[PDB]
């Protein structure tokens, strides 16, 4: 099996694993549609009940299953729980990390194509006050660049540069992942990130330096770090809070057990676990937040900047602080620097999702690495056509496998790791080999806390949220659901035959 | 590998794999919709110049690869060409049939839903002379039954009812098909062929007795019977006829080649594979040819007819016969039977059409029996679902793959088989083992005649019919081609898996 080269190669893939497009784009807008310093407290308190917690028991799953030949969760599931049904649960981290990476790939696509367009200045022009007349032609820009439909079908139309600019990403993508873990994602990982924090941080001090009739980005870090006690008791932002924990921690996708699986037996995950969280949290919280909010709120106020946030996921990210940037000096520029900082943070966790499918391919089917490799890239470039196409069938696919599935399989995984499997197996096996070991008090944390928190999240979840989500949709939202439930279907043939390749192997020795 | 057990019980169940829905549904809306005898010149002599060679090559082919434990083209194409391109192009024989029986179960589940409603006397109370109000009690009962769009969204409902009935209907095929060859699909047939004998020559007796101030059956039988050489030059009457000729003998599906793989290995195929094309023959042109439109134009004369067939597909079938048995004593059970007869066509059609997926997994997977059926019926369950909610989904499987797809694999195979592989090595490998010989002149229409008027066919085809089809559908069309597209690029994994697992075999023997 191979294995991480270095302490700090393992280090910072994992953490390029979580940092990503999570950090850039999607924390802000959570922290903004939640009350910006009312988000944080719950935020807080999820890292430290949940995305911790979890990290570490991801960790020892994947060396644990490692060190038996498999990294994924069809065969790590079964290890820890001899039932059938483990094998079937662990279908979902399969079907999670390939389904998210079939949306993801393409959006991280989307900052190759802005950033190409950036850098060579073929961008709008804006007319030198009125906010619209600088916003709209970056709206048109996005809108003609993915093709947002202009009548009553529900159908996009991407432009010739954009789905040539995908077919680019997935051969970038490719082109790592075909070198394997320590030639490929490690080394990759070596220079990315290191270029990701330095574009961040020139970005955060830009921006700091804003300042207009309508505020400075003192303003907006004021926003996001000024607590409110009074959202403590509001069931939606925890709802929000824990997903983005997820989502940003790279929780609950297969991905941090796939990788953790390539980690020596003996080798160390609990430091290593730790610091790869902790630096995830410092480019979410401290670089993340402090660029595009700040900038939104620089330039139109704490109020404006909230309802831009409300208005689409993508509209902070891709409309607003490039307008932004385009009323400042070298600001073209400045937007390029934004949308390349996306791209290497979409990639460095885009492999990381593309991993588990690999990983299985080789491990459970054997094919070679490339074959493995091309394949996986056959099906989420085939797939993503869904999501180039169809009008909010990237929000299905988020919805099901980004936001529930998560949860969903974190709760999974937890059950079969720390109760059927023996919370003190469990326990030992974290620690094994830890450089630090972890706080006595975790081990109530994970056996009980963690556990109870998630189960209630999902339940207050699946009362007063889905039942808006299966009866308020348009028809279309069946089309991804089909697609993506014989996605499921698919995957779960696969591990039957592995299962009897397996068999029959063991017959013939 | 099994073997047919019986002559008789090989020949009843390859004429059960052709006489089918297409014989009592499809050929009355073709000839009809054609000019009756007008389209019966160029059927003939499809016959004799496509049909009959083409189900001589398959036979052959079958018989060869079974020879050699393979009953699917992947492997047969390669075992006649050595070639990576022969097991893509193989794959279509397993990709049409899958497809085709897609859609073909549930039309043949409606049957089963008319039968059972039609015993138990619960269908429509027309009004005791106005045409439409005797009809359109019928329309409403098929539409509610599939549920037919009452508005704008290409969305179909079909009833509670018919979709248990589907289900019942999978069961009934997996029930066969789970026996295997001789226990399953050829003591079936025994049973099935002799029954759908009797039940249709009653029901054309039945029909020879309708008189009405209209018309009577004789006059149906001089529409269908009555030769008009003027339509000989007109290329569509053609390209139905062929169309035709293909569906109603099963060629070009992959699965009279995959019956044929288990036919021994010096077994006759040249009489065999005559009689069983001379079979369906005879319960197309005189059992189908003389129900349906006979009674039609006995109640509405010709001219009315004509403008049902031409109405839809399932017009003719689902809506007026019954309609207008309902009009006589005896009615509703004449109805029951005629929905029995195109059950039972339907079911020995349908196993046919799932068996290339079953010897697939058997043969070059290595699956059981149970688990190769199950999977199968698994897939194309859940692939119906397709069919059953959108609107026209139907059509465009019906088109890609019934169609367009036969015509092109049945003109891939000969070229492969009888070009590529030798003409005289395929003229020998027919001919082995014959109780009678194929016809000297026949080696040159296979080697010459047929693949140049299937080649001229196709051309004709794409230029002057497939343009107005790519521009002038609906845009939900493209569900459906990327979910048919989707199931190719999943065979072609298959293929691929199985070469590998081929691959490391070797190695271990
Ligand atoms: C591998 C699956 C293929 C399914 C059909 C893919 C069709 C891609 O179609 C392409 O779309 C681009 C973006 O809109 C257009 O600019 C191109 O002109 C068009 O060829
Ligand atoms: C990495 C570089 C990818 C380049 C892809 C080129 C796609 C060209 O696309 C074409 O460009 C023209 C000129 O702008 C436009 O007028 C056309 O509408 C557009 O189809
Ligand atoms: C399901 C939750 O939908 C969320 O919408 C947000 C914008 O409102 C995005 O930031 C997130 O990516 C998306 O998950
Ligand atoms: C379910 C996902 C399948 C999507 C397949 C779409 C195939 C491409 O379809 C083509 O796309 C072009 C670019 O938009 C259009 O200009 C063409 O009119 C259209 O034929
Ligand atoms: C929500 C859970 C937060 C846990 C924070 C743990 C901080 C570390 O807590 C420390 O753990 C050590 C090892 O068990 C003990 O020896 C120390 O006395 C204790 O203070
Ligand atoms: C491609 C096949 C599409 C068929 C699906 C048709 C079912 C439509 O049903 C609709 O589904 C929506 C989404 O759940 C709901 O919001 C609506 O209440 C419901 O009427
Ligand atoms: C295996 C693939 C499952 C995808 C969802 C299947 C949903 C079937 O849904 C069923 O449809 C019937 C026919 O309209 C309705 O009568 C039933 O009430 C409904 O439960
Ligand atoms: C093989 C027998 C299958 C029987 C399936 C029963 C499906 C019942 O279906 C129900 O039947 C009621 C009474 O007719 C109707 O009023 C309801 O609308 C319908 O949903
Ligand atoms: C593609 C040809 O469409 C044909 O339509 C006919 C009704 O017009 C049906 O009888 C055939 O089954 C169908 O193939
Ligand atoms: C692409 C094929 C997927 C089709 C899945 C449809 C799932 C079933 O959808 C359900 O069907 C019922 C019966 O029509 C409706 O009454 C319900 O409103 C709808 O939710
Ligand atoms: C379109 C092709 C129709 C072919 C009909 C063939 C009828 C049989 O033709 C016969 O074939 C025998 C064997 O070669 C010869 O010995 C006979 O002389 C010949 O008449
Ligand atoms: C589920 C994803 C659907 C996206 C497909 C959108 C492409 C629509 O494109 C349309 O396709 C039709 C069918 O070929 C053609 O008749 C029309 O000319 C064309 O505009
Ligand atoms: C940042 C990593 C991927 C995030 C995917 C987010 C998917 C949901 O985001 C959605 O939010 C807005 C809601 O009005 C819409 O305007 C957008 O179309 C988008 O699909
Ligand atoms: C008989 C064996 C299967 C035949 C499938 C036929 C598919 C095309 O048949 C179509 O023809 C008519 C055209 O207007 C439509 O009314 C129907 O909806 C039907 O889909
Ligand atoms: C799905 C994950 C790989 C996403 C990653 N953790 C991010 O924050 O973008
Ligand atoms: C697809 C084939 C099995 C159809 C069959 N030959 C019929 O006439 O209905
Ligand atoms: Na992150
Ligand atoms: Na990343
Ligand atoms: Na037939
Ligand atoms: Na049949």
């Known amino acids: 099996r191979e294995h991480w080269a270095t302490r700090l190669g393992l280090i910072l893939a994992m953490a390029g694993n979580a940092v990503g497009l999570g950090n850039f784009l999607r924390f802000p807008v959570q922290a903004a549609e939640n009350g910006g310093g009312a988000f944080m407290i719950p935020y807080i308190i999820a890292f430290l009940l949940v995305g911790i917690p979890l990290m570490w028991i ?157 505020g400075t980005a003192a303003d907006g870090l004021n926003f996001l770090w000024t607590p409110d006690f009074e959202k403590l008791k509001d069931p939606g932002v925890w709802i929000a809070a824990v997903g983005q924990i997820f989502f940003t921690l790279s929780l609950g996708f297969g991905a941090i057990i796939t990788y953790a699986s390539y980690v020596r037996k003996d080798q160390d995950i609990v430091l290593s676990g730790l610091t790869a969280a902790t630096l995830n949290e410092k480019a979410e919280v401290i670089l993340g937040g402090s660029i595009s909010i700040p900038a939104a709120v620089a330039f139109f106020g704490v109020a404006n900047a909230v309802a831009i946030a409300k208005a689409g996921a993508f509209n902070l990210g891709f409309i607003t602080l490039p307008a932004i940037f385009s009323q400042t000096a070298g600001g073209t520029f400045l937007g390029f620097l934004w949308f390349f900082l996306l791209f290497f943070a979409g990639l460095t966790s885009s492999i990381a999702i593309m991993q588990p499918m690999i990983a299985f391919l080789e491990d459970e089917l054997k094919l070679s690495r490339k074959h493995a490799v091309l394949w996986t890239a056959a099906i989420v470039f085939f797939s993503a056509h869904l999501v180039m196409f169809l009008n909010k069938s990237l929000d299905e696919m988020d919805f099901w496998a980004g936001t529930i599935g998560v949860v969903f399989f974190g709760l999974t995984e937890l059950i079969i790791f720390f109760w059927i499997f023996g919370a003190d197996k469990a326990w030992e096996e974290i620690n094994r080999g830890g450089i630090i070991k972890v706080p006595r008090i975790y081990y109530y944390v994970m056996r009980y806390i963690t556990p109870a928190f998630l189960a209630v999240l999902l339940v207050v979840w699946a009362r007063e949220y889905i039942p808006k989500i299966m009866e308020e949709t348009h028809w279309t939202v069946w089309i991804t659901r089909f697609y993506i439930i014989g996605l499921f279907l698919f995957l779960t043939f696969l591990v039957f035959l592995a299962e009897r390749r397996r068999n029959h192997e063991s017959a013939g020795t």
Chains 1, 2 share one sequence.
């Open 58 to 214: 991801e960790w020892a799953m994947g060396r644990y299953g490692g060190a038996q030949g498999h990294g994924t969760t069809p065969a790590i599931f079964y290890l820890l729980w001899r039932n059938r049904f483990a094998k079937i649960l662990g279908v979902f981290g399969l079907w999670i990390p390939l389904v998210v990476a079939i949306y993801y790939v393409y959006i991280e696509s989307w900052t190759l194509g802005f950033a190409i367009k950036f850098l060579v200045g073929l961008v709008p022009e804006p007319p030198p006050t009125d906010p619209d007349s600088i916003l709209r032609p970056f709206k048109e820009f996005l809108y003609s660049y993915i093709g947002v439909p202009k009548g009553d079908e529900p159908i996009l139309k991407p432009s010739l540069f954009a789905y040539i600019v995908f077919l680019i990403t997935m051969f970038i993508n490719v082109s790592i992942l075909i070198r394997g873990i320590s030639k490929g994602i490690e080394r990759f990982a070596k220079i990315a990130m290191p270029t990701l924090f330095i574009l961040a941080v020139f970005l955060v001090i830009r921006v700091f330096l804003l300042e207009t009739p309508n």
